[PDB]
């Protein structure tokens, strides 16, 4: 069904705004409203109110951090067509959204934003891999040591921590939660 | 059966309050009462009085029964109820609530969604904690010389403290603040 | 058969009191008497007189864990409430006069707390054992000046103290404070 | 469909310019427009508008290597020259007005240079990885006074910097200097 890009002034009037986690500073950067669906793109997630009837709505929430964006596509309108179509996959779920060709200028900005998000996520997955591999190379290099001047239990504690910090630091660095700056950059 | 979000002032009047562990500081943050069921969300657990007039009492502490797949469904023009769904442990819960009180059920949705996420992230951290302990065991395998029996005691203790401490940190028991953040 | 929660002052008048180990400071915290059975919950065990012969059973908590603690209320037409649990692997369902619900709900809370402590203890045992092994691995083949035979003795004592100490800590025998907390 | 090499001053008038990431300093170095398609070669990617709908494709060089760059001149009777290449695995053949041969030959040279740099980089990656391993092997099991946990951290950073650094060096993103060298 064909959708309308909503202006920022009318975000608070949208059904989707009730499900935005304003409490956690979640902010709406792009909203497309159709007769049957509402697609809300925030700094943290895609909030989607799915109408599977020609009036009840199923609420979905896909935080980017747990549901990566991939295969971002765009399709323009011909002379005879009334809509432009934007596509992507979030987690593994396929999204195809038809939008009033009048608002192409705006949908093209979303296309750019999503494309940039997908890439940052992709690159992050590559860095996680190196992060883990580096952890192993240390384990292998440092295997089989001597006591010398060593407090064994303290050293055992501290070593467990270093490993933890590295696995953790990298997990949160390369699975970033917030992509507001990406919408900020292209939605201007 | 269609339920009513109960007001805080009427929590001590509810059948579920008798099964809340007031002795351990358990506090009710959300209660939905229907003609057949009673669903009590405390800081520590879901307490469910289930009718199929007898009531079967279930208790699902969050620490041992993780919340997953938190869903919400709104009311159409013709419908009288909004539905909140989730899985606690493996059990599927679907609770119909008076559409009039949507403002409150949406807050529960947000709370549950936040708990589920915290628990998910904690599971991943446990994996890191365990994997890290192995990496030290490997790096420190086969040594030199040291007071062997004192070292043996102390080293066993570190391992224990590490395993235990992480177990309790990432399987947190209390989620009161999550309800407090979205309800109040 | 529908039972009656007995009052503390009438404990010494029950058939079950003859089988409580007063000599070891065993104290009755809850007794349900029916026309056929007698269920006696002490700090150390469930003593059950099963029936006009009676077969005596004793299930010390330390050797028979309590699990799957449930509760079931009465309907308008029912005269009883039912408390259920498994002790060791044995299934118990005990019908009690709905008039005494306030008391049976307390037993429910206590047994629930007992069961959880036992479960958590079984996890701690696992960490305790796993830690022992991690020191064995780290301390594997060493070197260094040392009184080998004394160190061998002392080392064997440490391992014994660890294994033993944790065995007694996480298979605790006495749960009197649990009953005390919820029956009080 | 026979295309036209567009002049730099008319780049901002092409449909493709709307999809260039000016915000990240992406600059168009070569644009061929046909009645159905639009091929836009930037420092970072091939942007292709495929056709009155147009499907937008973007193939950043860093994720889609250019290979098998070919060229085909016009015969007396032909109106076009054809430039071919594979990007990722996708086959591209682009017919262009034989009048503009002088320009398409420059694109040919640039794409040829891009493709070679990418190939050579894939060999360097292989050496970079193989070298990492040779240090792991040489540095396998050591001894010596040492702050084990700091050394473990620092060591893990080095490996990360090596893996990362080489990843970015040999999968370079920007090939603007290549176009600049042959279109100038």
Author numbering:
A (entry chain A): 14 to 67, 70 to 203
B (entry chain C): 14 to 65, 70 to 162, 165 to 203
C (entry chain B), D (entry chain B): 14 to 64, 70 to 161, 163 to 203
From the paper:
As part of our structural genomics effort in targeting novel protein families, we determined crystal structures of three bacterial proteins from a previously structurally uncharacterized protein family Pfam PF08000 [also known as domain of unknown function family 1696 (DUF1696)],11 which appears to be involved in the bacterial cell envelope stress response. These structures share a common domain that is surprisingly similar to the eukaryotic PH-like domains, thus providing the first direct evidence for the existence of PH-like domains in prokaryotes. PHb1 and PHb2 share a common domain that is structurally similar to eukaryotic PH domains, which we have defined as a PHb domain (PH domain in bacteria). The PHb proteins form oligomeric ring assemblies of different sizes and symmetries, providing an excellent example of how molecular architecture can evolve, where the general form of the molecular assembly is preserved, but its size is expandable.
PHb2 contains the PHb domain at its N-terminus (residue 14–136) and a helical-hairpin structure (∼ 68 residues) at the C-terminus that extends out and returns as two α-helices (α1, α2) to the PHb domain. A short helix at the C-terminus (α3) docks between α1 and the β2–β3 (L23) loop and, as a result, links the other end of the hairpin to the PHb domain. This hairpin attachment is crucial for formation of the PHb2 homododecamer. PHb2 is also a dome-shaped assembly, but with C12 cyclic symmetry that is generated by crystallographic C4 axis and a non-crystallographic C3 axis. The PHb2 assembly is significantly larger with an outer diameter of 150 Å, that is, twice that of PHb1(sl). The PHb2 dodecamer buries a total surface area of 46,700 Å2 or ∼ 50% of total surface area (3890 Å2 per monomer). The hairpin constitutes the primary mediator of the central core of the dodecameric PHb2 ring, mainly through hydrophobic interactions. The packing of hairpins involves the docking of surface hydrophobic residues of α1 (around Ile156) and α2 (Val167, Phe171, and Phe179) into a hydrophobic pocket formed by the adjacent hairpin of the neighboring protomer. However, only two main-chain hydrogen bonds [compared to five in PHb1(sl)] are formed between the two strands due to the separation at the N-terminus of β4 and C-terminus of β5 to accommodate the packing of the α1–α2 hairpins. On the other hand, the six independent protomers in the asu of PHb2 have similar packing environment and are essentially identical with each other in structure with an average rmsd of 0.27 Å for 180 aligned Cα atoms.
